[model samples]
Each structure stands twice: as structure tokens, then as C-alpha cells.
Target chain A: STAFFFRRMSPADKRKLLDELRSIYRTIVLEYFNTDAKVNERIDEFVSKAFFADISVSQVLEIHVELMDTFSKQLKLEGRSEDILLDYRLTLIDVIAHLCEMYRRS
Target chain B: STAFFFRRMSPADKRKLLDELRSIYRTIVLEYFNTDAKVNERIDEFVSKAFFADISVSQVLEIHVELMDTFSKQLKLEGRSEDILLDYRLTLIDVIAHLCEMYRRS
Candidate 1:
């Protein structure tokens, strides 16, 4: 029984938003490492969608933790250290910060 | 088997940093709601110290999760919704973003 601060969203709807957030999160993380591209646009767009969909902060952190754990396991399989992914915490922070800003002003 | 990208930080030192971080984080979150004072100074100072002491991003997130869980438990015991703390994710983000920028410019 999760408490939603905003309007109610079905579990199915929440799952869909989580899935999309995860995908965009992956892109942002990869982009942060490889291309040095600006991810503010992607993050702002995703944050907007997530906010309107009523995604909770805990839910977003859960998505971040799961994805990072997945990446960490894959890195281990490749005989690589997962330390590189640590900096990707920035991606999670960026999304949360953007969403936080929206809530602050909303 | 945690891997650190920066210089080695002994478990003892990391624990100390984590403790201080938890304290300061509480300050920032509380300040965010009650006083609404600018926490940039405190956050920047902590981030600088954390970076210099080789605190990893994962460690920071761990501190955040633990503190939030503590607050949530306290809220539940008081028969209040824990949803109010959701906005405090901004505190975590602000800290991380400050740290991330230090890494970016360092």
C-alpha cells in the first residue's frame, strides 16, 4: 500500500513509467561516460514525465539501484572493476534534482 | 569487493566521513524545509572534504539511503505518512551534484 502524494496512478502505469525511466537512465549514464554529451535535456524531459505520472522519489531510487546492480554484475562477468560506474551516480542525482526542482516550483 | 577510483580510503576513515555526512545531510534536509536557509556552503564544504578524502559516490548513496530509512521508520512510528520526505531527495541530489562538479573540474 504505497502512499502517493499526487493523484493515483495504477500499478501498471507506474511500471510503464519505471521502465521508461530505466531506459532513459541507461542512455544518460552511457552518454555521461562515452560521449561527454549534455544530458540535461533528456533528464528534464524524463523528470517532467515522471513527475506528471506521480512517480515517488523512493521508486526512482529503486530503479537506479536495480540498474546499477545489473551493470555491476555485468562488469564482474567481463573481469572489469565496477568502480567506473560509481560516477554514474551523477545521472541519478541529475534526474532527482530536476524532478525535485519541478516539485519545488510546482 | 568495492573498488575505489580515487586514492585508497581506509574503512576507518570512510566510516568517519560517513558519520559526518549523515549529520550534515540531516542538517541540509531539515534546513530545506524549516528555515529554508541556503545549504550550498555546507554542501560545498562537505563535497570538497569528501572528494579529498576519497569518498566514493556509492558510499554517499549508502549514507543517503540509511538516513532516509531512519526517517521513514520514525515517521511510521508517529503514524504519519512518510511521503513528505520525498522532496528531501533534493538534498541528496544537491550534495551529489556538488561532488560531481568537483570531480568534473578536478
Candidate 2:
């Protein structure tokens, strides 16, 4: 449950990843709620629940991708051709990759 | 930004906190699936999203409380008086306090 992977992340770089995640989380939550309620709220609740963890970067990215799989599927079912949720998930993926890259360099 | 309070937390304590949160998180997610899906899924998505955070304890509690306030009110509107979600939330509170205490002592 606890991740020594965090210490593998230096305090400075770790802080950087953590901050980006938090801000994106807040952004996605509020954005999901933007003239958007049901899907937004669902994304808001579950994502936040999974947010405050100490798992590896890959684990974080994996869980989010899995969660949004259903999220995206649910949307498609409603004929929601919109990419709002789609964009949000993609943004997180990019951020996650960036952090990994930072880790690789540092 | 990062939290100095986490450093105020010992690695042991921090690891402990991380473990408990991840466990409860997996718990709530799987349990939310216990013959449940919609509400459970909503809770699952947002909570997990928020779970992997580096925010203050109060903020964690605050966000969850606010999210669930809607969760509860929405349930009541449907005349669903079940406390399934209610109890899960209370468990996390206890866990949160315990971690804070562990931090306080260590």
C-alpha cells in the first residue's frame, strides 16, 4: 500500500509531480462539473478518492486510464460525441508521462 | 506546491498513512461494487481521483464531505435511505484521525 517509490522521487521532483496532479485534479473536477453535472460529479468523486496515494507513476496512470474507460464508455452510450472527458483524461496521461520523464532525467 | 506537513510526517508515519488510504480506497471501490453500481461508480471515480493527493488532511476531509453531501442529498431525493455510503465515509474519517494521531505522536 505504501510506496517507497515516492522516496525514489526526490522531494523536489516529487513535489512537482504532486502539485501538477493536484491542480489537474481540481481542474478536471471543476471542469467535469462545468455545465456538466452527472458525468462531472462521477469523475469528481472517484478521481478524488483515488488521488491522495503514494503509488508509483505507472500505477496512478493505469488506474486513471481504467476508470476513464468506463467513463468514456458511459459517455459514448449516451451518444456523447463530445470530447470533454476525453480531453481531461488525455491531459492527465501527458502529465503523468512528463513526471516519469523528469524522474528518468533526475 | 508541496506540503511541509508531510515532512512533519515521518517516512514511517507517511508510509503508514499512504498504506491505509490505499487499502480503504480499494475497499470502498470494491465494496461500492457490492451489488451496487451507479452511486458506487460515481463514488468510485471521484474518490479515487482525489485519493492520490498531497493535500492537507483537513482538505481531504473537506472535499470528501462536500462531495458526499451531494451524494447523500441526491440519494434522499430518490427516497433511498440506505446508509451504505454513509458507513464507508465514517470509516475513512476514523482512519484519517488515526494517521493524524500517528503523525502527532511521531
Candidate 3:
């Protein structure tokens, strides 16, 4: 019964959830990359192509989460907790590195 | 065997999965937010504070994926597939609209 109730959110509600996701991702990026000009430039190019140009914003957010998953794996191998300073810096670096490479090619 | 294998994902595997999620989210946000100042500002603020300030990238990415799951649920309720036009628009709009409201207040 609990599972059924939990699983039965409406489409409007689901949209609300996606909206929440975008908000969260927005928060994460701002916190990490706002000061890094290179990172910001890379992110700008990537978001423009992935979300606004060829696809929908929701898809854009979806792919963003997928990238986050990739970063998480790296953290695990380093034996770092989710609150470590070095871990966060390295993860951000990883994201920026990927963006630089991809955007340069694109 | 498949079920057991699926259920027995080690912590390392889970982290790798999280890394993948991060990569995807980065891609999505970059694609969408590059051209939209309002959207980019919102994301930059959110990510900076959420992922870079107080948490690990892995955790930030974790939260991002959680948000994605929420969006997927909304899409399902709306009777939308993973690839619909208006559905995607509505979803992205929902995200941005929320950011505008939140950022305006914050």
C-alpha cells in the first residue's frame, strides 16, 4: 500500500519533480563553477547544445544527472566520503575536464 | 542470477554509476543553460552552493540523480514518453520557472 501510494504521483507531480531536479543541478553548478571562467564557458557551450538547441530542457537535465553518476564512480574508487573537500574539487575538475575536451571537439 | 547480480551491486559499482550520472547531468545542463542567462545564473548559483560549497561532487551528483528520478516520475504521470516535444518543453519550463521563483526570493 505504501509502495503503491508512493508510485502513483500524477504527471503534474512528476513535472514538479523534474523541476526540482533542475533546481538542484543549477545549485550544484553555481556553487562549484561560478568563479571558474573556463568551466563556465565550457558549461555554457555544452548546455546550449544539449538542452536549448536540439532537445528539451528536461532531457538536458536528464543527461546532466547521467554525468553526475560518472563522477560518483570516481569518488568511490578514491575512497572518499561525499563531504570531502579534495573529493569535491577533484570531481569538479573531472567535470570541467570532460567539458573542455567535448566542447573543444564540438 | 540476474536479479541477484542486480541486487548485489557493490559500493564501488554504485559510485561508478553515480559518476556516469554526473557526466550526463553536466552535458544536459551545459546544452540547455549556455544561451539562457536567467537559466544559467540560476544553475550556477544552485550548483556552486549545493555541490561545491558544502558537499562532495559525488553527493551533489547523487542529489541530481534523485531529482532526475523525480522528473521521470512526472513524465510517466503525464503519459509522456522519454522523447516528447511539449512534454519536454513543459518539463524544462517547469524547471526554469521554479528557478526563477526560487532565485528571486533567495
Candidate 4:
């Protein structure tokens, strides 16, 4: 579940990391209300993974954009136009805040 | 423009802080498309203000929620239901990332 800090990630490794992140983030966003306690643990793990991998904030933004697009399409399929998932930005902010804290402490 | 880090905020001071934050955040959300370079400077200012005040990540989340509600009402008035402002989470993310970095280095 860990990648070498300074090593280049192979194509498969990058896809694997992104896939895992997507799954974790999907859970975080959808389970936000009832899973507050459990969510923090997962978020800490998410941040730890990204921090150790030296992922930049912008890269995380890209991940967010990609996920939002996917979500929007799903909403469209459900005959909805509301951005109900808009509030999930909190999750992104939490993850970035933790990642930033990691950098500041290093 | 700065408050003492350890001092308790009076009600007036807290309101003032939230008011200023609302204004700054309003600009960040509205001008996001065209103000990329300039926005970072403002975000740095925003983060520095909150960071020095020892604002928690959840506190920032509250600020975002309040503003989003305001924006939603504005959209309703304009007969728009789209969550068009969803992308502004990038601004929040940028600010939190910077603040986290500050904490990490402290």
C-alpha cells in the first residue's frame, strides 16, 4: 500500500493509487453524515498516503475534478440537476489541510 | 488587521472576522475563473489570517457552508438551480493546503 518516496511510479502503480484514492474518496463523500468518526481515520490514511508520495495540492484538485465530473454524469442519469454533492468539498479541504500539516512539520 | 493569537475574541471581533472572511471568500468564489494568479495572493492572505488566529479546519468548513447557502439563495432569486459555484472548492482547498503547510512547519 506504500510507494517509495523518491522513486518514479510505474503506470500500473499510478493507476492503482488513483483507483484506491477514488474508492476512499467516494466513501468519504457519500458517508459523510453518519461516518464522521470512521471517516477521520480513513481521511488520515488518505492524507498519509498522498503525503508520503509527495503528491501536490494541484494533483489532488485534478482528482477532485475528475470525480466531480463522474458524479455529475451519474446525477444526470438519475434525472437530477442539483449539485447535491457540492458540500463534499469539506472532505477535500480536510484531506488537503492534513497533507499541508504534514509538509509544514517536515 | 491582525488579532492577537492567544486573546479571546469578543463577539464584535468574531463577527468582524466572519464578515471579512465572507467578503474575501465571496471574491474568491466569484472571481475564480479569471483571477487565478491574483487569487493565490488573496488565498495566502486568507490563510495567513486564519492560521495565525489558530482557526481549525472545521471552522473553515463552517465558513464555506454559510457562504454556499448565501449563494444558493442568490441563485434561487436568479431562477437558477445549478450548483455553478461548485468549482470554488478549489479556492478552499488552496487556502487549506497553505494553512496546513503552515502548521506542518510550526
Candidate 5:
């Protein structure tokens, strides 16, 4: 369940938000990004394109929450712990922080 | 395999590095960290306490490599792909970056 901001939204708007978040999450998974060099090379792309310019604070978070839900479900179904999810999230947050911090620096 | 700096005729040095990296990698796994809040709360602990103050750059990389190797083996033995490894590395790099940047900022 989403919190205050996501609550009290019209059904259609909520659907659109979830759909957008899903697409972003898909890109994150498919993105061939891992190394520091990769972050250096590509983080700015997201900062410029995926942040307030192309996306919004709320929208990015919507994507994040959806991802957490999906990852947790996958682990539960596989009868495994969410250990992988925890590790992945650690990286996810760092990636987001790097992107935003760069924006702040600029 | 380790790169140039890690490559040399000093077997004792290599052994010591690997042993130390092993311990740091253990901490990374045992760490109950998830979410941006947790990362903000704990990453600096590693950054200050586990980084240049307490460990060297090469040592940090050594620990990272050990983690990559360990995570890869676990995934392979489980007959799974290494998608999780890639994501973890992304955050790992970011976490490291935040630490170094903080040091630079300080």
C-alpha cells in the first residue's frame, strides 16, 4: 500500500503512475550499468533525463516502491529469502543518491 | 584475478590482502542494511570506520572482489543467473562513491 501522496488518487491516475513506474523499473533492470565507470558515464544521463526534467520526485519513488514489491514477491514465490532484494536495494538507493547529488553539485 | 598492484612475487602480501578482504566481505553480508535511510545511517560507518581510516583503497577493492566471487558462486550453485550480482555491484560502487565524495567534501 502506498502512503499519503499515493493515497486518495483517482484510479486512472494511479494506474498511469504504476505503469510509468513499471517501465522505468524495466529500464533499470535492462540497463547494463554496474561499474563506477558506468555510473560516471551514465548516471548523469539519468540525472538529466530521469529526474525532474523527464520524471518527477514522486514518479521516481513510485517506481522504487513498485520494484520493491515485485522483488519481494519473486523471492517469496521462489521460496528464498529476500537477501538478494536487500542487496539490490542498497545499490538502487546509491544509484539514485549519486544521480541526485550530481544534480545538486551542478 | 587481481590486477597489477595485486600481482607480484610477494605471496605473503597476497595472502594477507585476501584474508583481510575476506573479513570485510563478511561484514558486507552480515550488515542488515536496506533502504536509503539505512544506507545513509550505516554507509558512513563503513566509509569512516572501514575505509581509508581503517583500510586502504586496494583493500577495499580486494573486499569487493571477494564479494563478487562469493556471490557468483552462490548463484551458480543455486542454478540461477547472476542478475542480482550486477545490481549489487551498482549500489556497491555508489556506496563507495558516496564515501569517497564525502571524504573529498570534508
Candidate 6:
């Protein structure tokens, strides 16, 4: 049954689905950062520390996943809606970009 | 001078630097989503549509960047801290992961 759903999907269909998913992710991230500031500061701090040392993309992805898990737990404890939680998730990505920009600037 | 600095960087050093940047981005994205919920719902909706349609990771990354830029602008208008904005960025990533997991599960 699981395989059946995807089995019928055309390559074009699959690409479209992936594109939509990516769009949603991108939209959420931008919206969240647009409204918050603490997130930016943290990113700046993170970037400064990272610049002074060594790091990798995978490590970044790992840290990103871990933080999301932590935040999800926090939301569960607070009884927030999926929308609110989603905003928090996007904020994290914004911070990362900010850090990158900071490092680039420096 | 700027190009010269990077030119002096050893391959290992470059890898380390890249890793650090990735880590920061990952950390921020994860942290933001852990606290919000609405984001999750949006992602779910997006993924469901995508599953019925098609999508790609690169498209997701592009949208992700656009959304972050928008959020960053919002924070500036609101006078919020960069840290808060960063949180929002991470939240988006969390939502993306949630959606991915959901699709993978289904």
C-alpha cells in the first residue's frame, strides 16, 4: 500500500511534490525571522564562534535537527498549535543564514 | 585582501569552516520549530499537496531562503532582537523535517 501510492506517481509529479514541500519550508522560515530579533542575535553569536574555529555542513544539519527536536518538546510542554511550532522551526534557518552572512561580511 | 585570506585557508580549514556554518544553520532551524505548532500544520498541508503532486530539495532550499529574508525584514520593522529572528528561521526547518517525516511515514 505504501509503495503503491508512490508507484503510480510520474517523475514530473514527484518533482512537483518535492518543489511544493521546498516552497512551504522556505516560506515558513522567512516569515518566522521577519517577526523575531533574538533569533538573529543568537545566529550572530553562533557565526562568530564558528568563524574562529572549524565546522561542516553535516554538523550544521545535525545541530539543526537536534534543535528542532528540543523545540518540539518545548511546544508540547506548552500546548502550542502546529502553526506556532512551525514558526519556531523557520526562525532557526533564518538565524543560520544570518550567521553565514555575518561571517561573509567579516 | 579578502580573496587572499581565503586563498591561505587549508583544505581542512575550509572544510571545518563550512561545517561550522552548517552546524549553526541546523541548530537555529531545529530550535525554532520545537516551540511553535502552526508551522507544523502548514508543513503537513504542504506535504500532503506535494505527495499528491511532485517536489525537490533544491526548490525547498530556495523557498527557505526567500522566507528567511522576508522574516528578517519583519523583525527589523518590529525592532526585535536578531536572536528572535534566528529562532523563527530554525522553526521553518523543523516544519520541513516534520513534513518530510510525515510523507516518509505515509
Model 3, position A37, has a per-residue lDDT of 39
Sorting all predicted structures by DockQ, with the top scorer first, yields 4, 6, 1, 5, 3, 2
Question: Which candidate tops DockQ?
Answer: 4
In the range A2-104, model 3's lDDT, one tens digit per residue, is 2223334324334555555455444455456346435455455553333222223335536455545555575563544543433343333343333322322
Residue pairs of candidate 1 with colliding backbone atoms: none
Which whole-number lDDT from 0 to 100 does residue A9 have in model 1?
A: 54
* lDDT tens readout by residue for model 2, B1-106: 1123433443533455554544445445345535644534444443433333343444445544554565667657444564455455443433343333222222
Ranking by lDDT: 1, 4, 5, 6, 2, 3
For model 6, how does the per-residue alpha-carbon lDDT over B20-57 read when each residue is reduced to its tens digit?
43344434444444665353454555544433333333
Query: For each model, chain A TM-score?
Result: 0.75, 0.36, 0.37, 0.72, 0.48, 0.45
Better of 4 and 5 by DockQ: 4
lDDT for A21 (candidate 2):
50
Q: Compute the lDDT of residue B27 as modeled in candidate 2.
A: 48
The CA lDDT of each predicted structure is 0.65, 0.43, 0.41, 0.65, 0.50, 0.44
Model 5 DockQ (Cα-based): 0.04
User: Which tens-of-lDDT digit does each residue in A46-76 have in candidate 5?
Assistant: 5444433334444555566677678677657
Q: Interface Cα RMSD for all candidates?
A: 10.5, 12.9, 13.0, 3.1, 8.1, 9.7
Docking class of 2: incorrect
**Per-residue lDDT of model 4, residues A1-106, tens digit only:** 2233333453435666777777777766666666335887777777776665555566677777777778788767444554566676766776787676555433
Model 1 reaches an interface RMSD of 10.5
Question: For every model shown, what is its TM-score relative to the native structure?
Answer: 0.46, 0.25, 0.25, 0.56, 0.35, 0.31
Candidate 2, lDDT over the whole model: 0.43
| Model 3: native contacts recovered, as a fraction | 0.00
Q: What is the lDDT of candidate 4?
A: 0.65
Residue B14 displacement (Å), model 6: 28
* Residues forming the 10-long window of minimal summed lDDT in candidate 2 chain B: B97-106
Sort every candidate by TM-score, greatest first: 4, 1, 5, 6, 3, 2
